[PDB]
Structures are given as structure tokens and as C-alpha cells.
Amino acid sequence: ADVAGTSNRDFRGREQRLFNSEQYNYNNSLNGEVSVWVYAYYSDGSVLVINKNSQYKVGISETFKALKEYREGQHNDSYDEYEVNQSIYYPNGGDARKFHSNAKPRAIQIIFSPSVNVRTIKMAKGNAVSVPDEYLQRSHPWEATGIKYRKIKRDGEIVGYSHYFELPHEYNSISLAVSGVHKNPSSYNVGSAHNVMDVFQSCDLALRFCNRYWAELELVNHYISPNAYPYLDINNHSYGVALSNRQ
Amino acid sequence: ADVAGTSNRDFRGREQRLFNSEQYNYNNSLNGEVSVWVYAYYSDGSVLVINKNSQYKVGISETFKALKEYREGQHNDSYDEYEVNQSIYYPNGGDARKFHSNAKPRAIQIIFSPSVNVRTIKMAKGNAVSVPDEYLQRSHPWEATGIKYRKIKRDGEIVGYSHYFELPHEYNSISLAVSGVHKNPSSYNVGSAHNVMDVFQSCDLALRFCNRYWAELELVNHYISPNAYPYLDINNHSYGVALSNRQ
Amino acid sequence: ETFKALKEYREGQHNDSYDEYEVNQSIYYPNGGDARKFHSNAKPRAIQIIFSPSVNVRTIKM
Amino acid sequence: ADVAGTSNRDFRGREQRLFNSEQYNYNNSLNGEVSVWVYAYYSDGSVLVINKNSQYKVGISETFKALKEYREGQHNDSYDEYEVNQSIYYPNGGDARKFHSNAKPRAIQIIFSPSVNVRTIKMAKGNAVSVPDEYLQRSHPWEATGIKYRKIKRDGEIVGYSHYFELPHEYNSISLAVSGVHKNPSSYNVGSAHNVMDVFQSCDLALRFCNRYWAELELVNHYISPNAYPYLDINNHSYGVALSNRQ
Ligand SMILES: Nc1ncnc2c1ncn2[C@@H]1O[C@H](COP(=O)(O)OP(=O)(O)OP(=O)(O)O)[C@@H](O)[C@H]1O
Ligand SMILES: Nc1ncnc2c1ncn2[C@@H]1O[C@H](COP(=O)(O)OP(=O)(O)OP(=O)(O)O)[C@@H](O)[C@H]1O
Ligand SMILES: Nc1ncnc2c1ncn2[C@@H]1O[C@H](COP(=O)(O)OP(=O)(O)OP(=O)(O)O)[C@@H](O)[C@H]1O
Ligand SMILES: Nc1ccn([C@@H]2O[C@H](COP(=O)(O)OP(=O)(O)OP(=O)(O)O)[C@@H](O)[C@H]2O)c(=O)n1
Ligand SMILES: Nc1ccn([C@@H]2O[C@H](COP(=O)(O)OP(=O)(O)OP(=O)(O)O)[C@@H](O)[C@H]2O)c(=O)n1
Ligand SMILES: Nc1ccn([C@@H]2O[C@H](COP(=O)(O)OP(=O)(O)OP(=O)(O)O)[C@@H](O)[C@H]2O)c(=O)n1
Ligand SMILES: Nc1ccn([C@@H]2O[C@H](COP(=O)(O)OP(=O)(O)OP(=O)(O)O)[C@@H](O)[C@H]2O)c(=O)n1
Ligand SMILES: [Cl-]
Ligand SMILES: [Cl-]
Ligand SMILES: [Cl-]
Ligand SMILES: [Mg+2]
Numbered sequence: 046a047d048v049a050g051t052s053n054r055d056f057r058g059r060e061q062r063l064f065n066s067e068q069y070n071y072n073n074s075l076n077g078e079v080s081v082w083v084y085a086y087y088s089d090g091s092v093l094v095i096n097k098n099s100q101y102k103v104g105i106s107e108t109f110k111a112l113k114e115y116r117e118g119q120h121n122d123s124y125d126e127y128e129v130n131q132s133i134y135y136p137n138g139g140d141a142r143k144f145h146s147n148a149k150p151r152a153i154q155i156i157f158s159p160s161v162n163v164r165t166i167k168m169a170k171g172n173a174v175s176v177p178d179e180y181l182q183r184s185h186p187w188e189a190t191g192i193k194y195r196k197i198k199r200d201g202e203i204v205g206y207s208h209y210f211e212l213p214h215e216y217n218s219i220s221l222a223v224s225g226v227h228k229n230p231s232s233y234n235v236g237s238a239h240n241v242m243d244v245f246q247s248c249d250l251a252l253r254f255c256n257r258y259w260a261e262l263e264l265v266n267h268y269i270s271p272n273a274y275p276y277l278d279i280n281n282h283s284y285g286v287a288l289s290n291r292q
Numbered sequence: 293a294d295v296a297g298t299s300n301r302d303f304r305g306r307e308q309r310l311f312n313s314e315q316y317n318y319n320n321s322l323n324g325e326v327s328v329w330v331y332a333y334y335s336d337g338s339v340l341v342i343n344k345n346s347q348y349k350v351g352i353s354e355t356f357k358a359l360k361e362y363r364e365g366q367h368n369d370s371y372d373e374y375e376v377n378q379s380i381y382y383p384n385g386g387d388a389r390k391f392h393s394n395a396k397p398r399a400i401q402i403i404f405s406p407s408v409n410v411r412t413i414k415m416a417k418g419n420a421v422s423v424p425d426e427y428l429q430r431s432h433p434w435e436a437t438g439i440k441y442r443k444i445k446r447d448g449e450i451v452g453y454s455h456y457f458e459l460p461h462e463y464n465s466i467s468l469a470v471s472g473v474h475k476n477p478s479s480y481n482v483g484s485a486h487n488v489m490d491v492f493q494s495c496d497l498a499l500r501f502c503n504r505y506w507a508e509l510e511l512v513n514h515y516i517s518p519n520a521y522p523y524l525d526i527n528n529h530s531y532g533v534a535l536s537n538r539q
Numbered sequence: 540e541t542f543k544a545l546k547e548y549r550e551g552q553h554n555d556s557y558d559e560y561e562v563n564q565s566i567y568y569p570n571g572g573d574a575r576k577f578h579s580n581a582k583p584r585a586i587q588i589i590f591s592p593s594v595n596v597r598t599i600k601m
Numbered sequence: 602a603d604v605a606g607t608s609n610r611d612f613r614g615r616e617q618r619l620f621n622s623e624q625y626n627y628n629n630s631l632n633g634e635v636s637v638w639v640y641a642y643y644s645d646g647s648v649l650v651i652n653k654n655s656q657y658k659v660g661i662s663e664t665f666k667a668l669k670e671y672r673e674g675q676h677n678d679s680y681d682e683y684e685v686n687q688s689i690y691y692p693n694g695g696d697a698r699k700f701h702s703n704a705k706p707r708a709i710q711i712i713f714s715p716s717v718n719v720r721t722i723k724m725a726k727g728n729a730v731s732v733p734d735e736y737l738q739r740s741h742p743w744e745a746t747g748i749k750y751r752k753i754k755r756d757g758e759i760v761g762y763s764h765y766f767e768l769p770h771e772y773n774s775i776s777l778a779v780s781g782v783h784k785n786p787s788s789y790n791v792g793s794a795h796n797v798m799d800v801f802q803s804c805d806l807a808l809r810f811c812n813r814y815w816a817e818l819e820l821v822n823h824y825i826s827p828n829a830y831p832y833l834d835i836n837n838h839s840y841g842v843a844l845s846n847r848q
């Protein structure tokens with residue numbers, strides 16, 4: 046045989062680069078996944094992740110209550126936290142024994158897979174009673190926030206898209222839903238009559254994941270990295286795997 | 293300037309009436325919200341509210357178990373209540389230490405925003421095992437109940453629609469789903485191919501809210517009124533805000 | 540005051556007292572403890588020291 | 602440049618030796634710390650450390666009750682231990698369900714920094730009701746125990762002073778206070794009128810530390826060693842860092 050890494054007859058090398066390009070391009074096909082993650086960051090350094098993975102389009106919708114920190118199998122001040130909610134829904138509406146619940150998220154990061162079309166991203170960042178914009182009567186049900194998404198890059202390749210906003214103020218009490226559509230550069234509408242029932246099925250077939258990790262380190266080590274997911278950490282470092290035309 | 297309230301040059305007054313009419317009419321546009329609430333009334337006077345707000349259409353679907361009273365951070369007879377469920381799913385199926393669970397709703401009120409089209413409202417009021425009509429084989433999956441909805445009115449204006457039914461009998465054990473579609477007097481189908489993917493996104497973007505309030509008074513004071521929501525109380529009094537062509 | 544003494548203590552409520560022992564061990568020496576949190580919410584976020592106007596400011600020591 | 606370690610022009614080496622000598626000599630100046638530690642050794646192998654660090658002079662004073670083992674966030678037989686105390690304060694004074702409390706220290710080690718003057722060390726080793734010598738009327742309030750302190754040495758340098766006494770007998774129930782004064786070879790009295798108010802301030806500025814470590818190993822690894830503290834272990838091994846005229 047030829048010697049490795051010296052000619053066009055390194056079929057091992059050619060197949061390695063094709064294997065990776067195929068993964069990159071499959072994900073971008075209409076047969077591929079589009080994925081979203083919501084990360085809610087708590088003052089104790091823990092992070093709630095909610096992930097959903099689906100064909101065609103994908104989204105996550107959570108209440109104020111659902112985004113609050115919950116420590117499985119430990120005490121959570123559950124009665125006092127009921128009272129916290131009452132005071133967040135209406136000023137002076139509760140009888141809580143704290144000014145600020147440490148269960149409230151300090152920040153949110155929304156990441157989409159690179160298979161999303163950024164121009165299709167929509168977000169409804171509502172108040173604590175789940176109203177998008179002050180009162181229902183004056184609410185557009187979403188904002189198209191795509192222009193705010195930063196490209197998460199590794200080796201020059203976009204491995205995902207991130208929108209990050211902090212909630213550092215006492216009045217930052219939110220409900221949250223986000224949605225994006227899989228890229229489709231073709232003129233075949235995946236929701237046209239020929240394929241619409243398959244999009245209805247994708248809504249049922251979408252796989253969801255949620256877990257609270259104890260630290261961003263643990264999230265990077267045990268969630269992001271093992272699964273080849275994109276991520277952007279507090280220090281603005283990008284994680285993910287470049288695949289297009291790469292060994 | 294002219295004197296206030298004496299001529300057509302009271303631009304403050306004209307803008308006030310326009311501000312309110314715009315809110316009313318925006319809500320009724322295809323860009324606007326449609327909203328539904330389910331209120332489940334318990335014998336201790338408390339009220340579970342489930343709200344969902346979304347573009348195009350909206351609905352809520354709950355199990356028998358999910359509609360039962362749950363007191364956050366307090367005792368709920370949770371083991372006995374497991375046994376209650378077993379006896380509700382099949383007669384004599386459980387080993388409960390009570391004849392009647394006080395966690396079962398005594399009544400349900402369904403309210404839609406005035407942006408719904410009443411003729412599109414559908415409800416699936418199922419038995420405790422989530423069958424619409426006795427056995428699946430003979431079940432139409434919904435009833436169109438719009439003719440039963442009463443107009444909630446303030447100052448002559450429809451501020452919402454209410455369907456109320458009591459569950460006062462031992463055999464009134466239900467699962468419940470309800471759905472309505474946003475008004476659309478145009479011949480532009482929001483679910484036609486041009487916009488169908490946006491309706492799929494609206495399903496993900498819909499914002500949900502749920503909370504148990506201790507009394508109808510607390511619900512009227514701290515939920516309905518602050519948010520300019522429509523409501524109909526036990527005494528048949530209407531709440532909400534008239535906005536069309538009003539200061 | 541000690542590090543331990545300045546940490547939040549909620550009289551008559553739960554304080555994660557065992558976990559907080561472990562937090563202290565990890566604060567005294569890196570990786571010295573076995574705590575189930577990265578950041579204890581009991582740690583002060585700020586300190587304000589106020590003296591009466593009867594102090595001589597040039598004598599203040601910390 | 603000259604070659605490293607071959608001439609008087611190794612300024613890196615000269616500065617390294619000066620850096621260490623300066624630390625040694627600063628500590629011995631009147632501007633420097635004097636420090637004391639009390640280690641109370643329990644039968645479960647755990648060790649309570651109490652440390653105080655201050656200018657001019659330093660001391661620690663503890664009750665019988667305060668020197669007993671306390672396991673943070675675990676059970677401590679707290680009611681029975683109240684009864685133990687009553688029986689230690691006066692024979693047959695309590696109603697305890699044990700003959701010997703395993704919370705009682707088996708030994709005490711007192712260590713001073715090498716900045717103390719050993720001739721100034723004073724100790725009040727009282728009975729369980731905090732009387733130095735049987736009855737108050739006949740009690741000198743302290744013993745000058747300096748002659749009993751062993752030099753803890755590393756590389757020929759005194760890194761601290763240790764007095765160790767075991768409490769292996771049923772009747773060894775003590776209260777304990779110890780005090781030492783910072784070296785002052787000068788004829789400037791730090792407590793004379795010129796500086797007395799600064800010594801009063803040092804009493805308030807003194808920093809204290811206390812913690813229970815699970816084993817002498819853990820104490821040596823995570824308390825003594827990281828902080829360059831002197832120590833003498835059960836096997837008579839010395840720990841600390843020699844600094845005078847050393848790289
Ligand atoms: N929407 C897209 N989806 C996937 N890949 C893209 C997209 N737009 C550009 N690329 C490709 O990704 C790589 C990086 O291009 P990009 O324009 O993001 O980088 P840049 O111009 O250096 O940075 P930026 O545009 O963020 O200032 C290029 O190979 C480019 O062809
Ligand atoms: N589907 C609708 N959506 C919004 N507004 C409506 C609708 N139908 C009528 N209206 C308007 O609402 C106001 C009240 O009309 P409505 O017919 O409800 O009252 P009514 O005839 O006095 O009472 P009812 O018809 O309930 O006996 C009128 O201004 C009317 O033009
Ligand atoms: N009070 C002191 N404080 C600090 N250093 C001292 C003191 N006394 C002596 N030294 C110095 O410490 C080093 C060790 O002296 P030291 O006399 O302690 O040892 P030794 O005579 O071998 O042992 P020992 O005297 O304990 O039998 C010498 O450099 C000495 O000059
Ligand atoms: N505003 C509050 C907060 C707490 N409590 C009381 O304190 C007890 C414990 O408080 P809780 O909020 O439930 O905290 P934990 O029990 O410690 O945590 P968890 O319920 O999550 O296990 C409750 O039984 C409740 O009676 C109260 O009276 N009113
Ligand atoms: N039909 C029943 C009802 C109750 N129990 C027992 O009674 C105990 C307490 O009852 P539970 O139904 O769980 O009520 P609470 O503990 O008071 O309320 P909660 O669980 O919601 O805190 C349970 O441990 C269960 O063993 C039982 O044996 N069989
Ligand atoms: N790092 C930790 C933290 C907690 N626990 C266990 O969890 C239980 C409860 O945790 P704790 O820290 O003591 O919190 P609370 O009991 O809820 O609060 P408090 O002790 O202040 O009343 C303890 O008995 C302990 O066994 C543990 O195994 N290790
Ligand atoms: N001489 C004693 C010892 C114990 N008790 C009883 O035993 C119970 C538990 O004993 P305690 O000494 O308090 O040990 P723990 O509860 O296990 O530990 P802790 O209190 O430190 O959590 C107490 O409520 C007390 O009523 C008693 O009657 N008389
Ligand atoms: Cl394709
Ligand atoms: Cl429109
Ligand atoms: Cl000096
Ligand atoms: Mg509780």
C-alpha cells in the first residue's frame with residue numbers, strides 16, 4: 046500500500062473526513078434533528094438544563110414556578126416558596142419569610158443546534174403570571190430575537206447559537222418559551238399538505254430532558270462534552286465539535 | 293390651548309380613547325393572543341386556576357388526578373389519595389379511608405378571552421380514566437359547547453365568555469380538555485401552507501400558568517383584577533375592563 | 540468574627556447544617572470538603588462597617 | 602550574566618533567602634503576630650482546633666462544656682450530654698445514661714508560634730466548674746508553664762512551642778485558658794502609656810478560628826501544612842517551615 050498521510054490513496058483518512066462531513070450535513074437535512082436548550086443559572090452555582098430534540102421544529106415552554114430551583118431529595122422551603130410565588134404574582138400577595146428567593150434564576154442561556162434557522166427563532170419572555178407584554182390585550186405573543194444570537198464557534202465552524210440574558214434585579218421574574226425551526230433552504234414546505242401529518246407526529250416524537258447539575262464545571266464535563274453539544278461558559282469560552290470537512 | 297373636555301382639540305382625550313381601542317382591536321387581530329382559563333373550585337373554598345395564552349388557538353388538557361386539590365408545602369393525605377384514585381378508576385378498586393375526597397373539584401368554570409371565536413370552542417369532558425364518552429369505540433373526541441357560553445359583559449362590552457358546570461354529585465369524576473381558536477373573519481387561513489409553521493411554533497410559544505388561590509375573593513383581588521382578566525363570580529357578578537372606544 | 544460566624548443563620552429554620560459543615564471544610568482548604576453545592580447562599584455578599592460619629596476615624600483598624 | 606549557583610551575582614538566590622528571612626524576622630518584630638492553638642483530641646480520633654492570632658499577646662479561654670466534642674449537623678446525645686455535665690459539675694448530680702462521655706477530650710496540645718516569649722506563657726487549667734485550684738479562695742489564677750514547652754524544630758530552627766498533656770483518667774475533667782505575650786527584647790513597653798490603647802485595640806482585632814477535623818491526618822494535611830503552621834503529631838514528628846537564612 047501507499048504510506049499513510051502521503052497520497053490520495055489514504056482511504057482511512059478520506060473515510061474519516063467523510064464520516065464527519067456526513068454527520069454535519071445529515072443534521073442539516075430535513076431528516077435531521079433541531080435542538081434547543083434552556084439553562085437557568087441559580088445563585089448556588091447550580092444550573093437547570095431543559096433540552097428538547099425534534100425534527101422540523103422545536104421549543105420549550107416553562108412557567109415562573111417551573112424555572113425556580115428544585116433540589117431533588119432535599120429540603121426546598123416548599124411552603125415558604127408557595128408564599129414567595131404569591132408575592133411574585135402580585136406585590137404584597139404573599140406571607141413569605143424572605144425578601145429574595147435564592148431559587149429564582151440569576152440568568153438564562155438559550156442555545157440552539159446549528160441546524161436551526163436563526164431567523165425563525167421566537168421567544169415569549171413573559172411576566173410571572175405568563176403574560177408576554179404587561180397585559181394580554183396589548184401582547185404580541187413572541188419577539189423574533191435571532192439577531193441577538195451569537196455564533197458558538199470551534200475551529201471556525203458554527204456549532205450552535207446562544208442568547209444569554211441575566212436576571213440580576215429583584216424585578217426580573219419571568220415565564221419563558223422559545224421556539225426555532227429547522228433550516229430548510231428548499232422550496233419544499235415541510236408543513237405543506239404532503240408532509241403536515243409528519244410534523245404533527247414530530248410534536249409527539251420530540252424527546253425532552255431536564256436535570257439540575259451542581260456547577261457549570263459538572264455541566265461542561267458531564268452534559269455538554271460527552272454528548273458533543275455546543276456551549277458557552279461564563280468566561281465566554283466556546284465548546285462543541287467541528288465536523289464539516291474535518292478529521 | 294382650548295379648555296379640556298369642551299372641544300375636538302382635546303388631543304389628550306382623543307389619544308386616551310385611541311389607546312384603549314387599539315388594545316381591544318390588537319387582541320382581535322391575527323397578531324393577538326387568545327386565552328383560556330380553567331377554574332376548579334374545591335369544597336374548602338380554594339380555587340385552582342390553569343391559564344394558557346397563545347396565538348392562533350389555545351387549549352388546556354388535564355387528568356382527573358391533576359384537577360384534584362393540591363396544597364403546596366402542606367399534608368395532602370397523599371397515600372390515601374392514591375387509594376381514592378384507585379377507587380375512582382374502578383368501583384371498589386381501592387382501599388381508601390374516606391367515602392368522598394375533599395380534593396375533588398365541586399365545580400369547573402371555563403373562561404375564554406373575547407378574542408376567541410365561540411363557534412370554534414371544543415371540550416372533551418371525559419370520565420376518570422380519560423375516555424370522552426363511556427368507551428373509546430363510541431366516543432366522539434369532543435363536544436362543540438359554544439352555545440352554552442355566557443357573555444361576560446362590562447359597560448355593554450363583551451370582555452370574555454364563560455361556561456360553568458357544577459360537579460356536586462358523588463359520580464361527577466372527570467378528566468377535562470378544552471380548546472378554542474382565535475377569531476379570524478378573513479379568508480386568510482392561519483393554518484394554510486404559508487403560515488402553518490408559525491402555528492406549529494405557537495404551540496411551543498404558548499405560555500402557561502397555574503396556581504391555587506385560597507378564596508374567590510383572593511382570586512378576584514390578586515389574579516383577575518390586576519391582570520385585566522374577565523371573570524364571573526359565584527354571585528353572577530362580571531369582572532373585566534371595557535376598552536373599545538372608551539376612555 | 541470568624542468566617543463561620545458571618546454565614547447566614549436562620550433561627551428556628553433549616554440551614555443545611557451538615558452540608559454547611561462540608562462547605563466550611565471546602566472553604567478552609569480547596570477540595571477539603573464533600574458539599575453538595577458550588578456556592579453557599581449563606582456566605583455574605585457584602586459588608587458594611589459603620590462607626591458612631593464619636594470615633595476618631597484615624598484610629599480605625601480592620 | 603553569571604551562571605546560576607556559581608557566584609555572588611545570583612540575585613534570584615539572594616532575594617529568595619532574604620524573602621524568607623524577612624518573613625521570619627517580621628513575625629518576631631513588635632508589628633508581628635503572636636499565635637496560639639489549643640487542640641482537643643477525642644476518642645473517635647477527631648480533633649477540635651481553636652486558634653487565635655493577634656498582635657502583642659494572645660490567649661484562648663474555654664469552658665468544660667465548650668471543649669466537649671460537637672459534631673456539626675449530626676446527633677450529639679444533647680439531652681443526655683446536659684445530664685453528663687450535671688454529673689461532672691457535682692458527683693451524682695445528673696441522670697445520665699452513660700458512665701463516660703466519649704465527647705470528653707482525651708488530650709490537649711497547646712502550641713504557640715515561635716514569636717511568643719516562652720517565659721510569659723500562662724495557663725489556668727481549672728476544674729469542670731472553672732476554678733483553677735480546688736476553691737477560689739486558695740487559687741492562684743494561673744501557672745507559668747513555659748519550662749514544660751518543647752521546641753518544635755525543622756532543619757534546626759524553632760518553628761513553635763508545644764505543651765501536651767493527656768486526660769486519660771475518669772477524673773480528668775477540665776476548663777482551660779492559656780495566654781502568651783509576643784517577644785519583646787527591647788525596653789519599649791508595648792503596654793506603656795504611649796501604646797496602651799493599641800494593645801486594647803489588638804484585643805478587638807484578634808482573629809479567631811475553630812473547627813473539628815476528623816483525624817490527625819486531615820489536620821496535618823488540610824490545616825497545619827497549607828498554612829505553614831507548627832505541629833507535633835502523636836508519633837512525635839515535627840511539622841512547620843524553617844525560614845531564617847534559608848531558600
Ligand atoms: N447560516 C449558516 N449556517 C451554517 N454555516 C454558515 C452560515 N453562514 C455562514 N456559514 C459558514 O460558517 C463559516 C463561518 O462563517 P461566518 O460568516 O459565521 O464567520 P465570520 O464572517 O468570520 O464571523 P461573523 O460573520 O460571525 O462576524 C463559513 O464556512 C461560512 O461559509
Ligand atoms: N362575536 C362578537 N365579538 C365581539 N363583539 C360582538 C360580537 N357580537 C356582537 N358584538 C358587539 O358587542 C356589543 C354587545 O352586543 P350583544 O349582541 O352581545 O348584546 P345584546 O344583544 O344586548 O345581548 P345578547 O345578544 O347577549 O342577548 C355590541 O356592540 C355588538 O356590536
Ligand atoms: N528564644 C529563642 N527564639 C528563637 N530562636 C532561638 C531562641 N533560643 C535559641 N534560638 C536559636 O535557635 C536555634 C536552635 O537553638 P536551640 O538552643 O533551640 O537548639 P539546641 O541547643 O540544639 O537544643 P536545645 O537547646 O533544645 O537542647 C539556634 O540558631 C539558636 O541561636
Ligand atoms: N412562610 C412560612 C414558611 C414556613 N412555615 C412553616 O415552616 C414549616 C417548614 O417550612 P417549609 O417552607 O415547608 O420548609 P422545609 O420543611 O424545611 O422544606 P421542604 O418542605 O421543601 O421539605 C412548614 O411546615 C410551615 O408550617 C410557615 O409557617 N410560613
Ligand atoms: N388508606 C390508607 C391511608 C393512609 N395510610 C397510612 O397513613 C400514613 C399517613 O397517611 P398519608 O395518606 O400519606 O397522609 P399524610 O402523611 O398525613 O399527608 P402527606 O403524605 O401528603 O404528607 C401513610 O404513611 C400510610 O402508611 C394507610 O395505611 N392506608
Ligand atoms: N453533604 C451532605 C449534605 C447532607 N447530607 C445528609 O442530608 C441530611 C439533611 O441535610 P442537612 O445538611 O443537615 O440539612 P437539613 O437537615 O435540611 O437542615 P438543618 O440540619 O439545618 O435542620 C443530613 O442528615 C445528612 O445526613 C449528607 O449526607 N451530606
Ligand atoms: N438521660 C437521658 C437521655 C436521653 N433521654 C431522651 O432521649 C431522647 C433523645 O436523646 P438525646 O440525648 O437528645 O440524643 P439525640 O436526640 O439522639 O441527639 P441530638 O439531641 O443531639 O440530636 C431525648 O428526647 C430525651 O427525652 C432521656 O430521657 N434522658
Ligand atoms: Cl432533505
Ligand atoms: Cl390581522
Ligand atoms: Cl519592632
Ligand atoms: Mg415542609
Ligand SMILES: [Mg+2]
Nearest residue numbers: 369370371372
Ligand atoms: Mg404520608
Ligand SMILES: [Mg+2]
Nearest residue numbers: 555556557674
Ligand atoms: Mg440536618
Ligand SMILES: [Mg+2]
Nearest residue numbers: 678679680681
Ligand atoms: Mg434529642
